[PDB]
Amino acid sequence: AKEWGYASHNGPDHWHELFPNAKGENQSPIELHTKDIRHDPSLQPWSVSYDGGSAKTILNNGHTCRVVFDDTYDRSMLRGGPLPGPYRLRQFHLHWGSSDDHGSEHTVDGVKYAAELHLVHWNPKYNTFKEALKQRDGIAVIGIFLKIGHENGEFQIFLDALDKIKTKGKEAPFTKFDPSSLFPASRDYWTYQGSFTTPPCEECIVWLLLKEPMTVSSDQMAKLRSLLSSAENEPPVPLVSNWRPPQPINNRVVRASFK
Ligand SMILES: [Zn+2]
Q: What's its EC?
């Protein structure tokens, strides 16, 4: 089906075989280089108005842990930034690596973080999420890096639910959670246009990658990387990494919202 993964056999180098978008010219993630980035004084701040009550479920689909929100109407919204209008929060998920010294998808001046949080939104202008996938700005993602430090209390609440989704196919209720609670102090961001870092890798994403990383504990990162990609009874298989290697920037330009 959508069969894919991050192993050498089913991994990123092979995704284009079944998912031809993977080989596109506007793929993500990318390496950011500050020598190649300027402050764009025209970039506006962004804001969110999330309803914690819009949270619905948490699930393990075999290649990440995802929280899903009610996006049947304009409930939890993201606005401003380089966006043409308000976008609906649909879900958030994470990428991680096998140890703390890597795991992020994007990198900044060569630096890699322990993980990357992606909050996925879409533009109601396009009617549905599925149709939004066919527009270069259909989806808007808030990318947040995760760095090692002190335990994050807000992140802990999320981690406390992982026990319910240890294996692939597991899905459990997850309500009353405002993921804005995870955001760092600064709303400073970089932006550029790219794709999903997972198949089918549609080129429909406006990236709002935050300058400041959220901090979590090494211990929390261990919990995050304790999930399995196998189902309740099978041969336990660890899901220890799910980050995609950097793709060609081509002629795209990343912009900074901050001086
Ligand atoms: Zn992602």
A: 4.2.1.1
Which of 96, 139, 138 is closest to 116 using CA atoms?
Answer: 96
Domains of the chain listed by start with CATH number:
1-259 (3.10.200.10)
DSSP 154-192: HHHHHHTTGGG--STT-EEE--S--GGGG--S---EEEE
* 102 belongs to an annotated ligand binding site: no
| CA–CA distance, 110 with 146 (Å, rounded to integer) | 15
Parallel, antiparallel, or unpaired: how do β-strands 65-69 and 87-96 relate?
A: antiparallel
User: Measuring CA to CA, which residue among 82, 88, 217 is closest to residue 147?
Assistant: 217
Q: What is the resolution of this structure in A?
A: 1.7
Length of the chain counted residue by residue = 259
Q: What phi, psi does 208 have (nearest 5°)?
A: -120, 90
Active site residues: 63, 93, 95, 105, 118, 197
C-alpha separations of 212 from 186, 215, 234 in Å: 6, 9, 39
Query: Of the candidates 204, 173, 168, 160, which has an alpha carbon nearest to the alpha carbon of residue 70?
Result: 173
E strand segments, the chain: 31-32, 38-39, 46-49, 55-60, 65-69, 77-80, 87-96, 107-108, 115-122, 139-148, 171-173, 189-194, 205-210, 214-216, 255-256
Single out the residue of 105, 114, 111, 211 nearest to residue 155, CA to CA.
Answer: 114
Strand partners, 173: 57
Whole-number Å distance, alpha carbon 255 to ligand 1 midpoint, is 20
C-alpha to C-alpha distance for 189 and 172, rounded to whole angstroms: 33
What DSSP letter does each residue of 212-225 carry, written as one string?
Answer: SPEEE-HHHHHHHT
> What is the Å distance from ligand 1's center to 126 Cα?
21
